[PDB]
């Protein structure tokens, strides 16, 4: 869904006075032709007949309008209603698939003025928005929680397997037993619950008001997982790697790559042609993820801290006086990395 | 939703009669227009024609008369039904938004008269309640079960992390490696969980009798939240901090003040203008939270221990001798207070 | 609920075909008033005129039957429809509090004959069945999953509790620091958890068919609760207590009583007054729960464990040749003893 | 659901132009009676008067026509229109069940065709497809949802049980104080959890596009459950069982037998008629669920190293050299099984 057409669903979601008209409108079984300009006289040729009301805009007068017949002439801001039971003609010569006059006279007119054309229908309790070459019908309020409050649990259960996922791979972290295998697995679950976040946004949208609680549970079970998959993909690509380079990898299989098993391996470096051998390739964390989270070391600092002792493992087996060796690692820092990842040592493993 | 409109909203609120009678109008599509006034006498002017009844009240006979069109009025109790098909008139100098004469007369009466007014639309399926300027559209029983079932879901995520968190910071608490971060993290998490019921409550007067399980589930999910939000804050405050003083603090963040991280540090006596300056800021909790919460000593008598001990810590290496030096302690509390805080550390650590 | 009304609201139960045709009554919007009689000559008085078809049963037939006004009469059993089209006469001066014909008829008809008459109003999209001087209305299918799916949501809530304070209570118990209070508090949690499988059981009735996934949710949730608030209480009371006892104190707080915590205590034998000296008695569990639940020694050769070593505490004190110097427990039973309490001291605690 | 019928169901589930058609229908309370057929020349016994269109499908199209009465005749593809308006006279020698004479024709006519027909009742919001000797009632999407839903949430209940049977099995395991009884605790939950998914199956098809949420929650939930089955039974099995061979035993309990516990210790080979004596029945693991599970090695290899160390328990005890006798197992191999077995005593023990 275009963030060009996601604009005009706005128009309508909950919340709006437009949407609070077209409720009162649909429980009436009441029909309408809405048309959105910003500027009538722009398009005299295509509004004939009505009435010229030219009056301010409000949930009640449209409502009230839609008891006549013909199209309703609204501004593009919905604060003004230009006119009521006027005659819309468009361009006959505009392709159509629709059957109705209602609906061929709203695609139509939508396709010819860009502008935006809804159409309730009287037999249907259906709200059709035409944008461009455009037409969202508006879901029922109940329908979206139902299908919102179903992308959310299928995305407590990803976010479920993936904290598992996780806390496996820590343990195996902390004892250097990591495969190729193992970091992909994690990444790929990361990767698809975040691929459900985005493909559940237009919903998220289309309920307007009624989307807070949903948002809400959204970012309560998304919060840390990118900055999380941002650092698996620094500790554990085959060569070293800039955080934004990174993120830039997080984004490519949110949107455009498939989380592939054997995709992610090979964008993190590795030259692996069969989803078998990942199992054979051993890795080890540089440490990245380890020294910001638990550590607290910014990644400015963490990069030194690598860049000395190279792995986690060996970041793991120096003492207190061998980090404070690293630019930017004092007496308190060394304290931390060596405190947070003894402590994770004597838990976790 | 100001206080003064849930009472109104009481009495229309699933479990009642008068819903039951309202509900009954919706199902067989017909209007209505209730006057609710205490003595009839003392609106003689706004109320003509109709019929006199004067008879009891009953979900029955509302219904029925329901069925002839104009108002009716009934007392404030609810006990009697005194006119049927009224001809309203009020003050028509008010100003109003509605352009149906049943709204219109709805929104002047109740503004006229400070009774309340309650509205059915014969087109829509709904439900209006005028109070003073205030306008209540009863929503659909199955939407607030739905909302409220949300919130509920929302609440939950909230809580989960909420239980990370603060078990994040026992461990750390242990370890006496606890940082403001870490404290503040907490604090606004469980700050944000409550403000979250605080913005349900409304809803779940609005559910009456079918509010029942949420109250159950809401308070399952907050029950010693609260306090141990007190707790924390008592622990963790620059100063030493009396309890009913935290208790301030929690209110203070749950309505007023936003649980930002940095407005939190600061409440707390933590001058800082940053919040990365946190992960660098050392705290050592009192111990009030351990003693009380773990092992069972009054707040009083933890003043005590706190007090000759200083720091949880500290607490947490104390003898069993050490223990009974303190005013308050017996040889009981000692055991308890050495025994319970043992016990975490080798479980948690 | 009484039963003797449950067993009529079964014969309207999703799935039934009574049920099938009365929602194709509704969903067509008409009316009707069904007469279920085990014999039609008995009440020969009370039905007058319509048509006599005393033909086989059929959710089409009563429905198409349903287009015609008057009342219908059916056999018992719901396999014979004996008229359509009668006019009902009961005793007109049996009370009723209803306004219409259509169910003042209904009402007094039960009332009169102890039959189930069903009563569907044409204006409202409700089936009222009245039984003997009962009057149930039968909610919408979709509601009840609403409500009963927030039932399950509420008990899925205090399981999570309870299982808590009984991980918590399990602890104390191998550290043998148990107090009355936490005993008590658990008993309360559990009796509460079973009080709502209760007074959710009629509505997983009204469910018939579709209550299958609720039957399963619930089992899933309690399946060992019981069992364990038995052993609880077993191994808690004051003074030694027999299984079936405990089991008439597991019923008696789940009707009866209700699950106060000094009303608990009280009845487990300690004589305490105020809530608050609980946490002041200490007590010591036999053995039961644990012997039989980790041990699996059953009840009646664990009788014969506690009966020589007392409490858990003691029994976890003893070697593997003092464990067989019991009735009932050779070699490996004493291994089982043994090793499961040796295992869960060097894990939980 | 017969595999058979739920190809046909496949034509009017949510996403298809047809259901779009037949939603539309529904909404505006038409009524309608659609006939598809390869071939009309092969029906035109059946079909009469009416219009020939012989057009392209549209669900816009149909939906008009709907507004018509009388039978449309569609192409088995559903890619043409050819009548509208049309009378249909199936064989009146079939017996029907239906009384409105829609239906009765749709069923004659779909029980002599061998062909789809669906019939749109008027006055009810229902669509229903008539087969062979099959009619299916098109739930209401809203419905589904619903019940799939609940499903989903019995099937969490059932996993989490799993769970924690499957997480207490491994602690006995590792300690080796295993009972016939507790892996077959663990399997019937194992077996019900599957059977579930089962019979949920034809309603995630029953929701076409729809049910893309509830089958990637249903594959998160069940996605290694039945290898994790297999290997249960090839380490518990009275004697020595083949991969396939144990599968050929999981898919007969989760579709012929019934998971009943005693049941399911005999199709193991444990001689036995009493679920009481498996408390008394001692079994020792294979190992190969760890072997493969945890330790990353193939059943095959696995059969060598078990072959070699007869139990998990001597698997358990294994050197890294003696680890290395056996065929397959090299030095990494070795570390492999040693590291990741010893991991999980200190952690889980
Ligand atoms: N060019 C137009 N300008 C203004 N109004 C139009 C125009 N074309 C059609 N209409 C409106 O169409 C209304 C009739 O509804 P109709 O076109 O039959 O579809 P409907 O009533 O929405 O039902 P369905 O479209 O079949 O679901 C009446 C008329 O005011
Ligand atoms: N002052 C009044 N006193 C008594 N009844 C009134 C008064 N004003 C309006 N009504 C009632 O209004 C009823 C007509 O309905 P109306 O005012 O058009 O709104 P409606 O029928 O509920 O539909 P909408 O509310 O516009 O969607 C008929 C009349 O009994
Ligand atoms: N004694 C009776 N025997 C048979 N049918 C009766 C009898 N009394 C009333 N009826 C039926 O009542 C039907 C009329 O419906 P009515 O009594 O007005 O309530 P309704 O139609 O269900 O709507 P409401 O009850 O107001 O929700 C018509 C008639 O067949
Ligand atoms: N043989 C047939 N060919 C074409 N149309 C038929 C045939 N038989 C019945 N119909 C259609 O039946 C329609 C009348 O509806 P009807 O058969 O009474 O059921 P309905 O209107 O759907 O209500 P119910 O199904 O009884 O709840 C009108 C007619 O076009």
Redesign the pocket.
């Given at each position: 869904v275009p963030q060009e057409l996601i604009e005009k669903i706005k128009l309508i979601s909950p919340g709006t006075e437009l949407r609070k008209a077209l409720d009162?409108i649909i429980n009436?079984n009441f029909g309408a032709l809405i048309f959105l300009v910003d500027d009538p006289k722009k398009y005299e040729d295509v509004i004939q007949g009505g009435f010229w009301l030219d009056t301010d805009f409000s949930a009640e007068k449209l409502?009230?309008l839609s008891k006549m017949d013909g199209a309703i002439v609204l501004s593009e801001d919905i604060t003004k209603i230009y006119y009521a039971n006027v005659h819309l003609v468009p361009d006959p010569t505009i392709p159509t698939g629709e059957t109705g006059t209602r609906h061929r006279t709203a695609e139509r007119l939508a396709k010819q003025t860009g502008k935006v054309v809804i159409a309730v229908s009287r037999r249907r309790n259906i709200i059709s928005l035409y944008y461009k070459n455009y037409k969202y019908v508006v879901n029922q309020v109940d329908f979206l929680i139902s299908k919102v409050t179903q992308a959310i649990s299928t995305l407590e259960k990803y976010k479920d397997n993936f904290n598992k996922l996780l806390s496996e791979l820590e343990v195996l972290e902390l004892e250097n037993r990591v495969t190729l295998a193992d970091v992909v697995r994690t990444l790929a679950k990361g990767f698809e619950l975040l691929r459900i976040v985005e493909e559940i946004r237009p919903y998220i949208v289309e309920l307007g008001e009624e989307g807070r609680l949903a948002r809400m549970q959204l970012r309560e079970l998304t919060e840390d997982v990118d900055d999380l998959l941002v650092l698996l993909i620094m500790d554990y690509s085959s060569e070293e790697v800039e955080e934004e380079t990174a993120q830039n990898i997080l984004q490519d299989f949110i949107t455009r790559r498939e989380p592939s098993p054997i995709s992610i391996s090979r964008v993190l470096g590795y030259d692996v042609q069969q989803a078998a051998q990942l199992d054979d390739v051993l890795v080890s964390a540089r440490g990245y993820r380890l020294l910001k989270t638990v550590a607290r070391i910014p990644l400015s600092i963490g990069y030194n801290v690598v860049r000395m002792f190279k792995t986690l493992d060996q970041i793991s087996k120096a003492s207190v006086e061998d980090l404070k060796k690293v630019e930017g690692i004092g007496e308190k820092r060394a304290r931390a990395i060596s405190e947070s990842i003894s402590s994770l040592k004597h838990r976790k493993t």
């Open positions: 009162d009436a409502y009230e």
